[PDB]
Tab-separated table of C-alpha atoms (C1' of nucleotides) in Angstrom:
chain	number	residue	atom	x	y	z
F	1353	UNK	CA	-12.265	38.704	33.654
F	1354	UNK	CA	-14.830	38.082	31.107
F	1355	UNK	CA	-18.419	37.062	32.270
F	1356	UNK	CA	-18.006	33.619	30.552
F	1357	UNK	CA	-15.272	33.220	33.441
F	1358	UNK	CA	-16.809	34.836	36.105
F	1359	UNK	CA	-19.996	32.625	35.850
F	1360	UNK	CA	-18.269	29.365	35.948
F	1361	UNK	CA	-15.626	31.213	38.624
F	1362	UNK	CA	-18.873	31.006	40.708
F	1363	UNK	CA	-19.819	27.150	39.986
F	1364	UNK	CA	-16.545	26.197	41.126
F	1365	UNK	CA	-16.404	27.349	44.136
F	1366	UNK	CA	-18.264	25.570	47.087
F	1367	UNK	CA	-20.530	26.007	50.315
F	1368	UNK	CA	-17.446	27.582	51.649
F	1369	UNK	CA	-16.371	30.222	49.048
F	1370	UNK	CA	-20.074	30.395	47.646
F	1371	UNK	CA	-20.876	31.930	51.118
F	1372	UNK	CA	-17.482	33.576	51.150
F	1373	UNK	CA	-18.565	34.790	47.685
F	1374	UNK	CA	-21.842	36.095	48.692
F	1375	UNK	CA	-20.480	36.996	51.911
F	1376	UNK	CA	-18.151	38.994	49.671
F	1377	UNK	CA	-21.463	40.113	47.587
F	1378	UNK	CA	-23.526	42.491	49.663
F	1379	UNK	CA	-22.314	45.075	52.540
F	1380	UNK	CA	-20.191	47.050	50.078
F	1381	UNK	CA	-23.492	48.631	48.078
F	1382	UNK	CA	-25.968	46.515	51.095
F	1383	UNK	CA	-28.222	43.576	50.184
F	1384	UNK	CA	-29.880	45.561	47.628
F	1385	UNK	CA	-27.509	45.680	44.720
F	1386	UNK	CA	-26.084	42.393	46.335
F	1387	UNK	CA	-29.685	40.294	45.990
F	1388	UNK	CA	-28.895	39.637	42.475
F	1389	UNK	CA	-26.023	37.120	43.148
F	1390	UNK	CA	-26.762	36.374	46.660
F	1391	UNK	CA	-30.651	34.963	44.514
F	1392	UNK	CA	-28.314	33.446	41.721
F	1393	UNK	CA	-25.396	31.857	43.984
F	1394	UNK	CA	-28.175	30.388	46.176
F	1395	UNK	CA	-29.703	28.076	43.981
F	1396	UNK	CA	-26.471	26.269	44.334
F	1397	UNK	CA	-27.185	22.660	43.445
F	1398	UNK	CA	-25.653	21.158	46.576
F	1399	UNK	CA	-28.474	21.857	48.952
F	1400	UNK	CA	-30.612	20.476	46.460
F	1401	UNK	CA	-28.170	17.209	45.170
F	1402	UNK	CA	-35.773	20.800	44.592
F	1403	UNK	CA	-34.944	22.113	48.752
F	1404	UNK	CA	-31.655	20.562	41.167
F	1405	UNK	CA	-31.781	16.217	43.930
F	1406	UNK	CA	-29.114	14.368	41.583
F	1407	UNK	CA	-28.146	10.649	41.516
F	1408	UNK	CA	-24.661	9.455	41.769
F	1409	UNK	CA	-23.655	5.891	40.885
F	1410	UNK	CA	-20.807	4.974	43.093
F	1411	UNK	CA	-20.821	1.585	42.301
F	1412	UNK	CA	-23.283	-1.355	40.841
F	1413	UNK	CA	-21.875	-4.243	42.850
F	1414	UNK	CA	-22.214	-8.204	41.470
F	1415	UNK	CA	-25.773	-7.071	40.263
F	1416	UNK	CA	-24.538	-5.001	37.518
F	1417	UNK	CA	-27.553	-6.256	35.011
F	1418	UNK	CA	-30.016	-5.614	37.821
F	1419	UNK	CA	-28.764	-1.797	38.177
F	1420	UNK	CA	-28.582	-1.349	34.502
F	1421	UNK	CA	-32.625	-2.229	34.688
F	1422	UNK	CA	-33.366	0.171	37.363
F	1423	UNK	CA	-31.720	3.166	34.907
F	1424	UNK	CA	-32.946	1.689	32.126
F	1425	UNK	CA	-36.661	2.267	34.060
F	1426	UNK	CA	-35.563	5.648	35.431
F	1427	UNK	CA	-33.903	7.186	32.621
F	1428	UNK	CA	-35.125	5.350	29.909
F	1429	UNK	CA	-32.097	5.206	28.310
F	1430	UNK	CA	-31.467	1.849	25.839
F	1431	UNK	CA	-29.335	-1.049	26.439
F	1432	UNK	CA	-26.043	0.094	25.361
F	1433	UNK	CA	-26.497	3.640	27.056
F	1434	UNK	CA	-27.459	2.520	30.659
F	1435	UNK	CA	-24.617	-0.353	30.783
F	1436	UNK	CA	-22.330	2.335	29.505
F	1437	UNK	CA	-23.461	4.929	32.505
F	1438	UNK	CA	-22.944	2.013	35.392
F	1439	UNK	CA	-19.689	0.206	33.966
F	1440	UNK	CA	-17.626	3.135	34.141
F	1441	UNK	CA	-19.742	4.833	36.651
F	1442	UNK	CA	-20.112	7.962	35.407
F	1443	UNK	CA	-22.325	9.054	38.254
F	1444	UNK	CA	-25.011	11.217	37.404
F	1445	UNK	CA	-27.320	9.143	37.109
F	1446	UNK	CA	-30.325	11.819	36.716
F	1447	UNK	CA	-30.470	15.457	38.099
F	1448	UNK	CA	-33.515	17.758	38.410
F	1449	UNK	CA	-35.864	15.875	40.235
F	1450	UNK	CA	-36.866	16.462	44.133
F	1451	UNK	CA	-35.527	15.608	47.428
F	1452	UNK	CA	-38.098	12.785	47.641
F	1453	UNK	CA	-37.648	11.597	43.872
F	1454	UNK	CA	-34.076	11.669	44.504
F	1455	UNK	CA	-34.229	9.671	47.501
F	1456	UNK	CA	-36.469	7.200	45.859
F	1457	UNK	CA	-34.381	6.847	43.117
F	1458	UNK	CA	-31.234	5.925	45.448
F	1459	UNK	CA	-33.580	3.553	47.318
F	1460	UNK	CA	-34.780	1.763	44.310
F	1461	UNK	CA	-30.960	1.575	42.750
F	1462	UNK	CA	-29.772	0.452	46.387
F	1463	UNK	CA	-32.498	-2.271	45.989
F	1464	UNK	CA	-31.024	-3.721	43.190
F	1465	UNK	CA	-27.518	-3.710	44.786
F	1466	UNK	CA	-25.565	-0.224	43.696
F	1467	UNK	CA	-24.035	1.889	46.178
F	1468	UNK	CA	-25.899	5.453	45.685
F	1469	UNK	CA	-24.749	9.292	47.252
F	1470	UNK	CA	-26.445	12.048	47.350
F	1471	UNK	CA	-24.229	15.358	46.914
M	301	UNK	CA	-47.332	36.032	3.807
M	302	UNK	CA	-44.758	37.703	5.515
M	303	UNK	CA	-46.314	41.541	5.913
M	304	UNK	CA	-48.322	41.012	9.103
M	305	UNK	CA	-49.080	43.335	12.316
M	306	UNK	CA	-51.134	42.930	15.221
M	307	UNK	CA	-52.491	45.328	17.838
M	308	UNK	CA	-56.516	46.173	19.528
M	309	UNK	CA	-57.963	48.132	22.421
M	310	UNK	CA	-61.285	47.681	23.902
M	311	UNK	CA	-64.512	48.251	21.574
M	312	UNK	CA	-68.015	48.742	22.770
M	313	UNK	CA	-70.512	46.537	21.881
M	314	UNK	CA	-71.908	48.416	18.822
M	315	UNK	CA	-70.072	51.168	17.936
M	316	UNK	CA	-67.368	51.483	15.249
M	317	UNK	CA	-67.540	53.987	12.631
M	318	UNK	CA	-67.362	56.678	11.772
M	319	UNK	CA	-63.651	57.004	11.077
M	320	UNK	CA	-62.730	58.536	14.503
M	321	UNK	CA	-61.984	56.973	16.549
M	322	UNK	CA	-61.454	53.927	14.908
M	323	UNK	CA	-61.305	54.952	11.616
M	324	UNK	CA	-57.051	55.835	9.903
M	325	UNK	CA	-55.944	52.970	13.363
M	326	UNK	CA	-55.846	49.711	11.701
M	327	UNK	CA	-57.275	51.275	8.659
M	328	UNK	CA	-53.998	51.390	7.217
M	329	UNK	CA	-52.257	48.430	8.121
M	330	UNK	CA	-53.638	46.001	5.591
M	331	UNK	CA	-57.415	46.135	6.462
M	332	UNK	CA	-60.532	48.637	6.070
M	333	UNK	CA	-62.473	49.873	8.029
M	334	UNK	CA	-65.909	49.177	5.193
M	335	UNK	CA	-66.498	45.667	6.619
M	336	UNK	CA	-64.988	44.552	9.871
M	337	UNK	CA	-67.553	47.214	11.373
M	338	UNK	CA	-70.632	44.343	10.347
M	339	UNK	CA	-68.109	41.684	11.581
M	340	UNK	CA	-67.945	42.961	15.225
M	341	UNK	CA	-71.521	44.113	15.962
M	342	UNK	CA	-72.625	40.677	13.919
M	343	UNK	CA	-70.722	38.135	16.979
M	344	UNK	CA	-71.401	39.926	19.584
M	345	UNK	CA	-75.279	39.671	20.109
M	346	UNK	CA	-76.610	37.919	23.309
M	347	UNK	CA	-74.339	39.983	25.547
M	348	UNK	CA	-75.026	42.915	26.796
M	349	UNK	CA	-74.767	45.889	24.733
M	350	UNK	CA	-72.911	48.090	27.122
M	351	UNK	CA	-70.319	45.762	27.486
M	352	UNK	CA	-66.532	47.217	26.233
M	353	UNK	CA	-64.830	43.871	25.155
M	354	UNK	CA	-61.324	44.342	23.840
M	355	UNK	CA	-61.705	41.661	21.243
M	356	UNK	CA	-57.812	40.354	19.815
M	357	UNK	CA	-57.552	40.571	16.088
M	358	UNK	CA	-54.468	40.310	13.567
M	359	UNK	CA	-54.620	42.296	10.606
M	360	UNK	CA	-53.916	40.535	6.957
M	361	UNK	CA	-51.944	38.548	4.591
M	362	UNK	CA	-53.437	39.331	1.881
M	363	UNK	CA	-56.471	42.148	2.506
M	364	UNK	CA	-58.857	40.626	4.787
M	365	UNK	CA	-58.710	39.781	8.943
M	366	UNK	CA	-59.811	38.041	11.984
M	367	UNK	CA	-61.697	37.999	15.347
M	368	UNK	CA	-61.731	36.543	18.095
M	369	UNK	CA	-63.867	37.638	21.057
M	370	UNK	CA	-62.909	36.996	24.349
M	371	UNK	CA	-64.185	37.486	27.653
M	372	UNK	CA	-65.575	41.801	31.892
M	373	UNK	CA	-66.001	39.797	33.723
M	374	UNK	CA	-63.082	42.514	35.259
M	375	UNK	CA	-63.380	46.221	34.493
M	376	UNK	CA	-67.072	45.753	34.715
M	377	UNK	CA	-69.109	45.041	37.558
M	378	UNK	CA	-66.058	47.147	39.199
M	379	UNK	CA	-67.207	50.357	38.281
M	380	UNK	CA	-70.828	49.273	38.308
M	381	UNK	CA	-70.302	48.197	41.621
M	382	UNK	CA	-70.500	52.209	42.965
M	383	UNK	CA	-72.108	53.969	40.671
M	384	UNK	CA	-70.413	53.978	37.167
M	385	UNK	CA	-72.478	57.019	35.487
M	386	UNK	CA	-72.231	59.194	38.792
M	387	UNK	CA	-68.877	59.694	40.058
M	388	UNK	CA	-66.607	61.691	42.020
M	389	UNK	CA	-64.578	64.319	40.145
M	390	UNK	CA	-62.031	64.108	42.848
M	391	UNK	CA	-61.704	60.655	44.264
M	392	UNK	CA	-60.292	60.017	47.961
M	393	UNK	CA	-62.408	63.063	48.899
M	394	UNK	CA	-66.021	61.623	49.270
M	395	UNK	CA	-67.304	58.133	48.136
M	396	UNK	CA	-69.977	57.098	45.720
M	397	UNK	CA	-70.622	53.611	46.746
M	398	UNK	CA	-69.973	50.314	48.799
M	399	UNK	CA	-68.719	46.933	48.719
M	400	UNK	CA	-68.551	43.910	51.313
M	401	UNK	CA	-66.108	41.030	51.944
M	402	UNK	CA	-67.538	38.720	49.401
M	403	UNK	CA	-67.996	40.984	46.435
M	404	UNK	CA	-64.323	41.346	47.173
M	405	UNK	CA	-63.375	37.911	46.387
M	406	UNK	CA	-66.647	37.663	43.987
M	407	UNK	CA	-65.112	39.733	40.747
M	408	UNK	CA	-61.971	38.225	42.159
M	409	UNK	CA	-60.369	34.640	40.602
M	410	UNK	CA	-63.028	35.615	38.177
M	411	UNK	CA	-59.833	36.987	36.173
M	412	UNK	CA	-56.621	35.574	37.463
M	413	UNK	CA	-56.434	34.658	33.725
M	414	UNK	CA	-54.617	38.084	33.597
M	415	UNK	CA	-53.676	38.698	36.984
M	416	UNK	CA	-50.362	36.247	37.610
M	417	UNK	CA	-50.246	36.434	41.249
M	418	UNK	CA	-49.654	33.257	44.018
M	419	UNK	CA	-52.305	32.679	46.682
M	420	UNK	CA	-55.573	34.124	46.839
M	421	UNK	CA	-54.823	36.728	49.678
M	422	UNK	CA	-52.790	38.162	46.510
M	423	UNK	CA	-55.445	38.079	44.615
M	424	UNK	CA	-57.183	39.848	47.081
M	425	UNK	CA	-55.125	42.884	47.700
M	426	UNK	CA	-54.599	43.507	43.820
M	427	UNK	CA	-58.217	44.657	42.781
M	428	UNK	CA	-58.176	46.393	46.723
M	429	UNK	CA	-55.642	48.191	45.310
M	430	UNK	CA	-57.661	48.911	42.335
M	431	UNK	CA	-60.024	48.562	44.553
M	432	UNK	CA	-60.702	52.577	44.362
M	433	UNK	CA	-58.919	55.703	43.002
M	434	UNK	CA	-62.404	56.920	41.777
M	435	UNK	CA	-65.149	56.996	44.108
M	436	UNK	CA	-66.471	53.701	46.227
M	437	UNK	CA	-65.058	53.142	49.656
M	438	UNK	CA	-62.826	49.880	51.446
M	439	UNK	CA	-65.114	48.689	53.464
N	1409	UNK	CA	5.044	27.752	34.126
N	1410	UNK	CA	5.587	28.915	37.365
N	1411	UNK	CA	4.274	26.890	40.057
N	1412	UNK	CA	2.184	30.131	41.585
N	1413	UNK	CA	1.106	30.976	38.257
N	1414	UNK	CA	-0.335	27.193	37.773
N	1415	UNK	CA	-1.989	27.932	41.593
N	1416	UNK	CA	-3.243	31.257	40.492
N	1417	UNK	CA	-4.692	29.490	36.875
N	1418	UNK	CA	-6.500	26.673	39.161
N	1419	UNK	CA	-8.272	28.817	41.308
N	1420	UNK	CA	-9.377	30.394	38.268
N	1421	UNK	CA	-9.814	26.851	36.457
N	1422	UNK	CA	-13.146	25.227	37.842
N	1423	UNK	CA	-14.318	21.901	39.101
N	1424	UNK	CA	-15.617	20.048	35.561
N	1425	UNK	CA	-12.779	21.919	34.749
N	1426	UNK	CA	-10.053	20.840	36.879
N	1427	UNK	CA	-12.201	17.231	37.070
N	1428	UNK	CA	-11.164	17.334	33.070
N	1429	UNK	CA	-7.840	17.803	34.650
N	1430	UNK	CA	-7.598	15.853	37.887
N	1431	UNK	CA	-9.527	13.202	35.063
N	1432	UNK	CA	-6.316	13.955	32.482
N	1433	UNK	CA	-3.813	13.389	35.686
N	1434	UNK	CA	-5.454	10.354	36.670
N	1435	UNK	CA	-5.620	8.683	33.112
N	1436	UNK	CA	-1.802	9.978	32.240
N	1437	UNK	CA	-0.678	9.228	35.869
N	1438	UNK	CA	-2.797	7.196	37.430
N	1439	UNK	CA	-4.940	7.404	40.979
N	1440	UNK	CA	-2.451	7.044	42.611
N	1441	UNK	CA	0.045	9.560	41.267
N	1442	UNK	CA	-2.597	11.835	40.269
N	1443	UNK	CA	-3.881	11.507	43.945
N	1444	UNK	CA	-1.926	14.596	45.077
N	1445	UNK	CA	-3.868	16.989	42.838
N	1446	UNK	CA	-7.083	15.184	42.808
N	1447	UNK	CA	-7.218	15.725	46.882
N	1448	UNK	CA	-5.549	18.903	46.310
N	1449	UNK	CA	-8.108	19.931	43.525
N	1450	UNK	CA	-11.398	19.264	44.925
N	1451	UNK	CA	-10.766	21.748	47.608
N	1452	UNK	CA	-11.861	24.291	45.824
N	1453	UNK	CA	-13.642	25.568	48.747
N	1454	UNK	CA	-14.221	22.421	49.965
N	1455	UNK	CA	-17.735	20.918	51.296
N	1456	UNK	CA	-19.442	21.448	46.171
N	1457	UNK	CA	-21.282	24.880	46.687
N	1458	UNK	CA	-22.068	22.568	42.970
N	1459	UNK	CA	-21.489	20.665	40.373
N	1460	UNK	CA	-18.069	23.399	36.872
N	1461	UNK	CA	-19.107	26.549	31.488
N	1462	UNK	CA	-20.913	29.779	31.630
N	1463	UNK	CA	-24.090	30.925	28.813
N	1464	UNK	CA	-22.916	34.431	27.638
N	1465	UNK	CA	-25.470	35.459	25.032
N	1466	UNK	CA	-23.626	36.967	22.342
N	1467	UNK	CA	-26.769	38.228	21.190
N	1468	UNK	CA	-30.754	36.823	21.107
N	1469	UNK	CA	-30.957	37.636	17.544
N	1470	UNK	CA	-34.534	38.531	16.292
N	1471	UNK	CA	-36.123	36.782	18.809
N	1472	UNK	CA	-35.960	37.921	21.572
N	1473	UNK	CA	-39.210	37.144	23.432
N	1474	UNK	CA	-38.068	33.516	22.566
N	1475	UNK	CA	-34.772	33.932	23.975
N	1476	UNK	CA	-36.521	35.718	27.343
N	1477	UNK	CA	-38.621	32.680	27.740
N	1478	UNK	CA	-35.875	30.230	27.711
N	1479	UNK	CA	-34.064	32.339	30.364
N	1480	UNK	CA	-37.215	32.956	32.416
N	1481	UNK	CA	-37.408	29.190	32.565
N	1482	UNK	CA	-34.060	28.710	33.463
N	1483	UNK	CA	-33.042	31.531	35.676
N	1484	UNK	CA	-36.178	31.271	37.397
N	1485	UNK	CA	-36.007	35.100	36.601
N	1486	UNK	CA	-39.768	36.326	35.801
N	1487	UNK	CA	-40.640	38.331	32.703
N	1488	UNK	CA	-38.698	41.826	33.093
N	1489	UNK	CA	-36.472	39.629	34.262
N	1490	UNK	CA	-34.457	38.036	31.245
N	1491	UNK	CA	-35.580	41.031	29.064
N	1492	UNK	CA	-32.350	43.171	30.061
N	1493	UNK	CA	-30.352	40.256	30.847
N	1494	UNK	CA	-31.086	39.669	27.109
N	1495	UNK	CA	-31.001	42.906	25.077
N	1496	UNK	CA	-27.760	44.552	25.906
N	1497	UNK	CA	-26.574	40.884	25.977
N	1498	UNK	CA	-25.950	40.998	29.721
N	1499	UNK	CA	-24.147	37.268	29.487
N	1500	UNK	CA	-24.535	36.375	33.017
N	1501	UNK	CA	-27.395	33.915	32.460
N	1502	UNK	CA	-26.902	31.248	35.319
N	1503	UNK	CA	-23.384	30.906	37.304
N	1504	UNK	CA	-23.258	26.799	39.160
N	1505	UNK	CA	-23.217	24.570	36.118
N	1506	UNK	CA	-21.240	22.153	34.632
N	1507	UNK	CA	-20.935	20.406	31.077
N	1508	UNK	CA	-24.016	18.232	30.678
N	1509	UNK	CA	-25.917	21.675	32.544
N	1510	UNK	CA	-24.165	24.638	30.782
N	1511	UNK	CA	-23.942	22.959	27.055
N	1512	UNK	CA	-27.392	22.132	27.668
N	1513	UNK	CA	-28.411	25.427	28.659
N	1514	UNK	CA	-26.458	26.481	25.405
N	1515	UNK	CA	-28.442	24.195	23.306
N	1516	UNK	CA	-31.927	25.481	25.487
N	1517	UNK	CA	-30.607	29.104	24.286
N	1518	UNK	CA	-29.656	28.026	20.870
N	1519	UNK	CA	-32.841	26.781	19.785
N	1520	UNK	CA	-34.224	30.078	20.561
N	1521	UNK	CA	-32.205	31.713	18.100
N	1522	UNK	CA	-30.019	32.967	20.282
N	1523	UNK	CA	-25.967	32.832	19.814
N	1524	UNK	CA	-24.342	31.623	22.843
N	1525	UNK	CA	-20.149	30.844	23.745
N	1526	UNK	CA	-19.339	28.130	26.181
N	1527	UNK	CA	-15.438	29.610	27.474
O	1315	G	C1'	-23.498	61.812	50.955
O	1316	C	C1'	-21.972	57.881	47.734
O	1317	C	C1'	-16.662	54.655	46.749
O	1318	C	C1'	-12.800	49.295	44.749
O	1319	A	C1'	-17.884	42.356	48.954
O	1320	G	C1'	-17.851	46.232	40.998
O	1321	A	C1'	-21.180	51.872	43.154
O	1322	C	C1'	-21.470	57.318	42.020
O	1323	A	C1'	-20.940	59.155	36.621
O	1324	G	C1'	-19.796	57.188	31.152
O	1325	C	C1'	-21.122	53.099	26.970
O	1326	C	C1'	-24.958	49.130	25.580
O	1327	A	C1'	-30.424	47.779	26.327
O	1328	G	C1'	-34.682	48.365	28.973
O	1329	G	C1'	-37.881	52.207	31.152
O	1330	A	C1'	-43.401	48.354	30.826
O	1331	U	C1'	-49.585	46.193	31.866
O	1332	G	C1'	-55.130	47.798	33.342
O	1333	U	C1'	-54.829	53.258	31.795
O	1334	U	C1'	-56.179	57.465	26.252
O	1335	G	C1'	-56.792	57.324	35.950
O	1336	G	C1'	-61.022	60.404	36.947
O	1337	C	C1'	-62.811	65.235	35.906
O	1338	U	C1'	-62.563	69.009	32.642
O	1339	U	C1'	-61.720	70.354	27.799
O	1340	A	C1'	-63.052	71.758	20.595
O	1341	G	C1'	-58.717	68.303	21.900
O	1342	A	C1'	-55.012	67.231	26.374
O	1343	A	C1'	-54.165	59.829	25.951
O	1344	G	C1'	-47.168	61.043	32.180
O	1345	C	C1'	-46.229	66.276	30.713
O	1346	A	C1'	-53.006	73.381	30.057
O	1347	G	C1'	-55.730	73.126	34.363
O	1348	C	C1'	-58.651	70.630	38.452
O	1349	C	C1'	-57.997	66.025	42.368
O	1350	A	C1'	-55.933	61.644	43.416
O	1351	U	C1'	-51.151	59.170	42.394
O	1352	C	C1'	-53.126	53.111	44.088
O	1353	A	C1'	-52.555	48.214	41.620
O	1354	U	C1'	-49.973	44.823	37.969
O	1355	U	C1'	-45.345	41.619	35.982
O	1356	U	C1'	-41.899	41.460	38.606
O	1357	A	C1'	-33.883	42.937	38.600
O	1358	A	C1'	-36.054	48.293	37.464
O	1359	A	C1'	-40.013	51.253	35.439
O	1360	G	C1'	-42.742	57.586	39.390
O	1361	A	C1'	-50.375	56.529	36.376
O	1362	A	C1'	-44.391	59.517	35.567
O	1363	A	C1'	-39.111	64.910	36.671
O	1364	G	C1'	-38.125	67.608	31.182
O	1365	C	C1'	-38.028	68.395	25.470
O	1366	G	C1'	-41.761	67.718	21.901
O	1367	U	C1'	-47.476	67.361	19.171
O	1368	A	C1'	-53.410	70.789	17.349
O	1369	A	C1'	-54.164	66.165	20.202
O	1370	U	C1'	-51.178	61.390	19.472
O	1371	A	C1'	-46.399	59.923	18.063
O	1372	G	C1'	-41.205	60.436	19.012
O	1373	C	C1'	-36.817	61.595	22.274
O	1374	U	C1'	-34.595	61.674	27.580
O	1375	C	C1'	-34.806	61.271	33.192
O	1376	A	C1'	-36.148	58.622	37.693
O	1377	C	C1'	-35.142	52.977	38.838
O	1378	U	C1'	-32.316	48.181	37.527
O	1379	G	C1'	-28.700	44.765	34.856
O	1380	G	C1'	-23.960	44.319	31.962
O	1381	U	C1'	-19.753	46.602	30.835
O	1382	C	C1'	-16.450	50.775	32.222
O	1383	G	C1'	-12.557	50.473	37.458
O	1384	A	C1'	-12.012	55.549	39.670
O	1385	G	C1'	-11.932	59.657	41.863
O	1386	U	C1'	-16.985	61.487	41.706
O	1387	C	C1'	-21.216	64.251	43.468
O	1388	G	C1'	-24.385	68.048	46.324
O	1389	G	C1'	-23.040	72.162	49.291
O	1390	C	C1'	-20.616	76.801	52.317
O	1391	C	C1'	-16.835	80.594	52.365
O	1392	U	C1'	-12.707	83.523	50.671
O	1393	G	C1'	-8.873	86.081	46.828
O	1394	C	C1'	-8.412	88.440	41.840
RNA sequence: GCCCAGACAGCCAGGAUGUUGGCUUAGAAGCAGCCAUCAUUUAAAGAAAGCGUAAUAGCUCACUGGUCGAGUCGGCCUGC
């Protein structure tokens, strides 16, 4: 299939196949030849949702104008654009940052009353 | 504006013409080798003389150049740190000089501006690897 | 078509993917209808390895160096690194993305001068 | 010995940095010869196995990635 298949093929997959995938990327030619996607499957966002740690908005509560500050602080994003990412809860509420940023950030958005998970 | 080219090895302190070696090099990308020769040996004097600097310059836009010395520390000091003028023909035979534990690390991070490498230990066993392959022992 | 075709074409699908779908079911159907699939869907094995497209480079154009950087940054790959994975036009650039990561990385390539498909 | 958890060979693109390594040599800067043959960025790249230059340059190989998706490669013996 063409590599603009094969790539995403990848992202779909999970923990399970990931490792299934890698576990199907190495003996056959050993770990040599396999390192390149056993390196490139690794940094699998998941154990690092550093260790890509997202946000996820499951819900804002009765404080929705008091969430909408805390992403309007964290993202930056104006008025209009942070009520738009809590209303319909679009999750991601910001990806790249650390383990500890992430956690902060859930803290901070539990503080003002949203239910937060961390993939 | 757009006819431009760009390339420059190490120069000793001084010397430039006659035409080899430096002489049809760069000559004949845009800029001469007439001036340039004043415009090297003009900027760099308070150093010392024997000092091969591989200063980075362009070429032209229109007929003219550029400089831009830069900084041996590195190179240097290395090969005058077991005799530079005397050396051994055939290195990993004999030795020629020696070198302790601290002017290991001494002409080290004194050029990690070209040598990309994490921790210092790295840094370390980079110029021990460089260390010698011409005279001068390990320890 | 066929019912093990439509299996076959979802384990090829992805999560964004099949999220555009499960997404599709749930706004046609409804979360409850579109409950069979969306439980059915994520699955994917799942726990989500994580999250979908992919960033083939078609080509990196005249600049090349820029288009290296832009994958060193990404990839994580060092110099030598993207340089291959560049010329010949390699298109495996990073496999675990989804739309807001692999149109971005698009755009991060694009700006390079560097023609890249999202498929 | 290497083989369908994408290699061994094709095709595409790399094959680098200190360094024109030291010595020697009219000159030899991977590639007359004499000794070493480490380090660097790092998916790979031997201070380099060949062609080539007066010396450079240029062109391949080793090694790695993509694609190609299948029989391929080194070797011993016997018949005409």
């Amino acid at each position: 299939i063409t590599k603009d298949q094969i790539i995403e093929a990848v992202a779909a997959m999970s923990v399970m196949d990931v490792v299934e995938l890698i576990s199907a990327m190495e003996e056959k030619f050993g770990v040599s030849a396999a390192a390149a996607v056993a390196v490139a499957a690794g940094p699998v966002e998941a154990a690092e949702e550093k260790t890509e740690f997202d946000v996820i908005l499951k819900a804002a509560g009765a404080n929705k104008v008091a969430v909408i500050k805390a992403v309007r602080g964290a993202t930056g994003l104006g008025l209009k654009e942070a009520k738009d990412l809590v209303e319909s809860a679009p999750a991601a509420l910001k990806e790249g940052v650390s383990k500890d940023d992430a956690e902060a950030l859930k803290k901070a958005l539990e503080e003002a009353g949203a239910e937060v998970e961390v993939k | 504006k757009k006819v431009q080219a760009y390339v420059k090895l190490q120069v000793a302190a001084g010397m430039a013409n006659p035409s080899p070696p430096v002489g049809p090099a760069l000559g004949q990308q845009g800029v001469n080798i007439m001036e340039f020769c004043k415009a090297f040996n003009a900027k760099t004097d308070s150093i010392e003389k024997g000092l091969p600097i591989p200063v980075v310059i362009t070429v032209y836009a229109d007929r003219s150049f550029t400089f831009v010395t830069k900084t041996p520390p590195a190179a240097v000091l290395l090969k005058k740190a077991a005799g530079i003028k005397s050396g051994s023909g055939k290195p990993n035979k004999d030795k020629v000089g020696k070198i302790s534990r601290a002017q290991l690390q001494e002409i080290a991070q004194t050029k990690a501006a070209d040598m990309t490498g994490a921790d210092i230990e790295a840094m370390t066993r980079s110029i021990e690897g460089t260390a010698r392959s011409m005279g001068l022992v390990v320890e």
